[PDB]
Design a protein around this ligand. Structure first.
Ligand code: HEM
Length: 152
């Protein structure tokens, strides 16, 4: 649960992402894959990537970063009223991709890391607080659907 002022911060931060969605999406995925190499094994289409240089050169990885962040941005713009948008993603990630909730924690922290890396000094303490709460809400509502499905 976020206040109106917290949502305003979230959507202000998101404007930084929307100026370069592919560059942010690429870096989020690279941070996820290099920090937590077990996550790469869930992607049949990226498991061939052995080095970060190959990851950086991969246009398909940048494409997938765009898909991921476009979906997250659509959810965030709902300011918590995201049941219809979140349900299919929860279902696909539990039943088809088999993504443990832990990996959603990993990517949440990676988003925070990338924002500080690309906007040093321009991602303030209030903005970090609001973004973190928004990603926690997203993860918590996914977790509820995972529990319904019995997925661990
Ligand atoms: C911010 C969180 C994330 C969002 C919004 C997101 C969004 C999406 C979307 C929109 C798709 C394509 C449609 C679908 O299959 O449902 C996708 C595919 C996928 N997601 Fe996620 N995702 C997230 C986190 C993750 C994480 C943490 C992993 C694994 C570590 C992951 C693994 C996958 C995989 C394996 C695919 C299929 C890729 C393919 O082969 O084309 N997702 N995701």
């Amino acid at each position: 649960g976020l206040s109106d002022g917290e949502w305003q911060q979230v959507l202000n931060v998101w404007g930084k992402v929307e100026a370069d969605i592919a560059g942010h999406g690429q870096e989020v995925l690279i941070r996820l894959f290099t920090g937590h190499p077990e996550t790469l094994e869930k992607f049949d289409k990226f498991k061939h990537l052995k080095t970060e240089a190959e990851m950086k050169a991969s246009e398909d990885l940048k494409k997938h970063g765009t898909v991921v962040l476009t979906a997250l941005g659509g959810i965030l713009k709902k300011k918590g009223h995201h049941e219809a948008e979140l349900k299919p993603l929860a279902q696909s990630h539990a039943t088809k991709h088999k993504i443990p909730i832990k990996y959603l924690e990993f990517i949440s922290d990676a988003i925070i890391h990338v924002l500080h890396s690309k906007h040093p000094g321009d991602f303030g303490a209030d903005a970090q607080g609001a973004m973190t709460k928004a990603l926690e809400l997203f993860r918590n509502d996914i977790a509820a659907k995972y529990k319904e499905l019995g997925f661990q």
